[PDB]
Paper text:
RtGH124 is the defining member of CAZY family [name]. Unusually for R. thermocellum, RtGH124A is not targeted to the multi-enzyme cellulosome complex of the organism but instead consists of a ‘dockerin’ domain which instead targets the enzyme to the cell surface of the bacterium, followed by a CAZY [name] catalytic domain; RtGh124 is therefore an unusual enzyme if its primary role is in cellulose degradation yet it is not part of the cellulose complex. Here, we show that the metal-ion site of [name] can accommodate a variety of metal ions (but not Ca2+) and that the histidine is modified by a carbonyl group at C2 to make 2-oxohistidine (but only at a fraction of approximately 0.5).
Manganese is coordinated by Asp141, Gln172, Glu175, His176, His264 and a water molecule. The reasons for this are unclear: it may reflect pH, the partial metal occupancy or histidine modification. High-resolution structures of RtGH124 (1.40–0.94 Å) have revealed an unambiguous modification of C2 of His264. In the case of manganese, the metal and the His264 modification both display partial occupancies of 0.7 and 0.3, respectively. Occupancy values were similar for other metals under similar conditions, varying from 0 to 0.5 for the histidine modification and from 0 to 0.8 for the metal.
Residue numbers in the entry: 140 to 350
């Protein structure tokens, strides 16, 4: 039951309706997916509880889209849509040159179709799956916070290793810090959001809250 909008909704309407979703509604979509997939999320990432897992994915929504669910960027393998900026590489049958993601059997891999790419519900499901693809690769060589940290580097770059430490900080550590703002300031359900570089956000020891 992953799709949010009616099957058959046009591309234009999927985008327009995503654009009009309230922040609280995007948070609810993310929570639904985290609830549905908690066991695999916990097994891969070792997050302490569902609440901090919600916050982690709110951090991703913040870093990727500033909670603007109709955000669309990139080209080819980087072409991404939705609150988590789910790339085409997440999807089954998208392009023969995309590296396969057959290591998350706990989550269905939706086919690459207009509805599956542009529906916010499918997009969020697939973003979580795509992140777990890379986090599971990271767990082969990393532990603790480094699973999620390098999983995020894979999500954004295609590669769990080899990014600059300064992008690990500006992208992955930023994501962790942004997510914690929601938990610490009672924004887990309301329409409030933070943003990349917001000076209010506490960036010290940004991973500790999750474990
Ligand atoms: O490269 C990582 C991801 O970046 C996403 O873009 C984000 C920008 O990196 C981020 O700086 C920007 O933050 C803005 C915010 O949108 C604005 O409202 C505020 O006033 O200033 C902030 C700092 O400049 O947010 C965008 C996301 O909305 C890409 O969308 C994503 O594809 C990419 O992976
Ligand atoms: O050399 C190995 C194979 O590489 C394939 O290209 C991959 C890029 O190397 C990788 O950087 C890119 O990663 C995407 C990522 O999947 C996505 O989530 C993010 O938004 O954008 C990243 C790029 O900025 O994925 C591609 C495809 O898997 C070549 O296509 C392949 O021929 C080659 O064998
Ligand atoms: Mn799902």
């Amino acid at each position: 039951n992953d799709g949010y909008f009616p099957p058959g909704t046009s591309k234009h309407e999927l985008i327009a309706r995503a654009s009009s979703l309230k922040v609280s509604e995007v948070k609810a979509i993310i929570k639904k997916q985290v609830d549905e997939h908690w066991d695999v999320i916990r097994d891969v990432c070792g997050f302490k509880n569902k609440e901090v897992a919600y916050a982690f994915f709110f951090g991703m929504a913040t870093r990727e889209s500033t909670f603007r669910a109709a955000t669309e960027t990139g080209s080819g393998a980087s072409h991404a849509f939705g609150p988590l900026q789910t790339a085409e590489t997440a999807y089954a049958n998208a392009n023969p040159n995309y590296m396969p993601e057959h290591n998350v059997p706990e989550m269905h891999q939706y086919d690459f179709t207009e509805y599956n790419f542009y529906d916010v519900g499918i997009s969020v499901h697939m973003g979580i799956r795509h992140f777990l693809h890379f986090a599971r690769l990271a767990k082969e060589k990393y532990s603790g916070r480094d699973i999620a940290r390098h999983g995020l580097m894979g999500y954004n770059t295609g590669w769990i290793d080899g990014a600059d430490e300064s992008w690990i900080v500006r992208y992955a550590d930023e994501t962790a810090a942004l997510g914690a703002w929601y938990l610490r300031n009672n924004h887990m359900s309301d329409d409030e959001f933070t943003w990349d570089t917001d000076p209010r956000v506490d960036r010290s020891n940004p991973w500790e809250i999750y474990y």
